[PDB]
């Protein structure tokens, strides 16, 4: 679409670190941003699992004592573990920084059109640019399952549904490029055709 | 004006972006009676030279455009068009002026060899 860039910037959450992808996105969302992060069950957290076990299990014992319903609502999806981050990094008690989370839709298991729209990688927050060898990491997939997320195997089967018809839409497109490289043959005697682009590219011929 | 619908008007160096190289104009006469002082709007005499006169609104006293100017226009755009087709058709020589600047991928406003 059309906007300050598009009206979306779709980001895959696969292989990224949870809090560096948050402070990139909470900065960009205050620029007037529109991101829509998908596959949130794949965000990697640093440290091993019994580090982040303990820390999510300490953030859920913080409940109000007078009436626990008022106290911190502890959301247990993977996409709400991440949306909780992008609220620590956003002025959410203002009418400016509340419109900045209303650009943020955040999904976990890549649905509904964010499966055909091109989604991009944030190399400032990738794991395998940041985190060393020898260093264990986690995923928010298993963290949310071990803290009570009842839809882990829901979306894993839904992934294999859209992984399966991806092979049907690539074998539509793998042979279709094979038609183009044959369609590229009949035009080499078009008029004077390709010479004006190849004299500035030529490295792909 | 034949090519681009733009007459011999007069622009500042502030409102203009000069590209890289030239177009060769080695023997052009540049018919020097086209002076800056030669081409005011002539004029608004506050009414019709009679002095202290009457007016109705919406006068058209500023844009014919000048009949002599159409003779100077057909002089240059004759001689310019014998030049500009004889160039090696590069990026900006023949049909190559005629499209509306708004740029494109992998290129610049910042730090170009423009």
């Amino acid at each position: 679409m059309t906007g300050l860039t598009n009206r979306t910037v779709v980001i895959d959450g696969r292989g990224h670190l949870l809090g560096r992808l948050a402070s990139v996105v909470a900065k960009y969302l205050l620029q007037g941003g529109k991101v829509a992060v998908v596959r949130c069950e794949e965000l990697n957290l640093s440290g091993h699992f019994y580090r982040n076990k303990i820390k999510f299990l300490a953030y859920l014992r913080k409940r109000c004592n007078v009436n626990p319903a008022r106290g911190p609502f502890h959301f247990r999806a993977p996409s709400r573990i991440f949306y909780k981050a992008v609220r620590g990094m956003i002025p959410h008690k203002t009418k400016r920084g509340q419109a900045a989370l209303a650009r943020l839709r955040v999904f976990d298991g890549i649905p509904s059109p964010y499966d055909k729209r091109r989604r991009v990688v944030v190399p400032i927050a990738m794991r395998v640019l940041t985190l060393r060898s020898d260093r264990k990491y986690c995923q928010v997939g298993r963290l949310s399952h071990e803290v009570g997320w009842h839809y882990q195997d829901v979306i894993k089967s839904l992934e294999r549904k859209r992984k399966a018809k991806l092979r049907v839409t690539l074998k539509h497109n793998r042979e279709l490029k094979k038609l183009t490289v044959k369609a590229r043959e009949n035009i080499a005697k078009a008029a004077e055709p390709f010479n004006k682009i190849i004299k500035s590219y030529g490295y792909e011929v | 004006f034949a090519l681009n619908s733009c007459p011999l008007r007069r622009v500042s160096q502030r409102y203009v972006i000069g590209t890289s190289s030239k177009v060769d104009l080695g023997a052009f006469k540049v018919p020097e009676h086209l002076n800056d002082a030669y081409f005011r709007r002539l004029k608004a005499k506050k009414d019709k030279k009679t002095g202290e006169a009457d007016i109705f609104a919406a006068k058209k006293e500023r844009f014919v455009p000048n009949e002599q100017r159409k003779k100077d226009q057909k002089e240059v755009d004759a001689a310019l068009l014998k030049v500009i087709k004889a160039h090696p058709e590069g990026k900006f020589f023949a049909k190559y002026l005629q499209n509306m600047f708004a740029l494109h991928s992998s290129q610049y406003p910042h730090r170009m060899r423009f």
């Binding site: 205050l30 400016r96 | 409102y15 203009v16 972006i17 730090r111």
Partner: protein, 78 residues
């Protein structure tokens, strides 16, 4: 980076927006008045990475934060 936003210094940036009224004629080249513009001028560089400051004519009402202003290309050094 700071060599990039050092290009735009001196350019008349404008912030353009809209309003309900016209209240005014077409006085010079035809004016409808549904569109409001606050003209400005970029002044200096700001960041260490290519952000920039700009003093305007009035002062940008801050529900304009995150809305587009148009940095012009004129007045141009080459």
């Amino acid at each position: 980076r700071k060599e990039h936003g050092s290009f735009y210094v001196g350019k008349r940036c404008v912030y353009v927006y809209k309003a309900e009224t016209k209240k005014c004629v077409p006085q010079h080249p035809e004016r409808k008045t549904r569109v409001r513009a606050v003209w400005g001028k970029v002044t200096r560089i700001h960041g260490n990475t290519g952000a920039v400051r700009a003093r305007f004519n009035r002062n940008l009402p801050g529900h304009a934060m995150g809305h587009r202003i148009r940095i012009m290309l004129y007045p141009s050094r080459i």
